[PDB]
Design a protein around this ligand. Sequence first.
Ligand SMILES: CCCCCCCCCCCC[N+](C)(C)C
Ligand SMILES: CCCCCCCCCCCC[N+](C)(C)C
Lengths: 160, 160
Amino acid sequence: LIVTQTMKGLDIQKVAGTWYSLAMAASDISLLDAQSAPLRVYVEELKPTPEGDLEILLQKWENGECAQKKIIAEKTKIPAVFKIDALNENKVLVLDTDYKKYLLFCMENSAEQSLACQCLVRTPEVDDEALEKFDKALKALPMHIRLSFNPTQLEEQCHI
Amino acid sequence: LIVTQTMKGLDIQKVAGTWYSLAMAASDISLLDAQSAPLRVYVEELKPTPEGDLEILLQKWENGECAQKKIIAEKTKIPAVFKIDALNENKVLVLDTDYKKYLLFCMENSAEQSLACQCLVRTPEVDDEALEKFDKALKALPMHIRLSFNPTQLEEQCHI
Ligand SMILES: CCCCCCCCCCCC[N+](C)(C)C
Ligand SMILES: CCCCCCCCCCCC[N+](C)(C)C
């Protein structure tokens, strides 16, 4: 637990729909520095299942192509926290969302930390306010790389 | 002129000596995203000539090696601004320095902008205060990539 910022009162049904990865940050440069860096994932769509799990549609540059990936994040007893299947089993946390304009989330390793966060917005627009929130959520965290994307890039697959 | 932050009262004789590129930022992701990205330059030493020009010793990852480069920055009528030889002739500006602990500077293209800034410190240490200054100098600028380095990396050639 490096991330001690979770959304109280979260209803994942309302995070449904389209999102744009406006900004990203990570604890290690190599997590985000290249198109094919392991945590450079661009969120396309959130699908909350009836059960309350969270499917995630994303783009990730893998073999020189911009590939479509589907990720299932399984709900926990904490409504703001979800779990993905991997060797280390990675944790997704929702820090803050207004549902209508922005959503802030981080992904973190159970063990070693290793951490990346994103500022998601609904439309291809530089939302100053939400970036402020993201920045303020960042100061508490040991980030060493930050990226942010313009409205042109936001409309391209893998933000090209 | 995107950068409208210059040091008043600057004496480049006192910027003499050792510096560490603690943090960097740029207007375009591709300027800083890889070891061999064009503006990923790590400052090693500043040498102000008697005339008042500014030689710069740096490291830059070029052909898989971490190479030593010497850059001469020629003084202008503005004491805070210097000029480097290139096709576009690049401008170096000193935004703020206490001489003893931190120095903030940017490099910018005369035409298109294209811009990178660094927070330099004297020792291999995460200076929170100077990073605050760097952050505050950044909010005015359209940066899309930011990096920062830990004390271990600061002691390695090309911050490895
Ligand atoms: C609520 C928002 C959820 C979005 C989370 C997307 C998870 C990115 C997957 C990276 C981890 C997988 N890995 C290690 C194999 C590359
Ligand atoms: C006061 C501090 C001064 C440090 C400035 C160092 C200049 C970096 C050189 C990059 C431009 C050269 N280029 C385009 C060929 C890669």
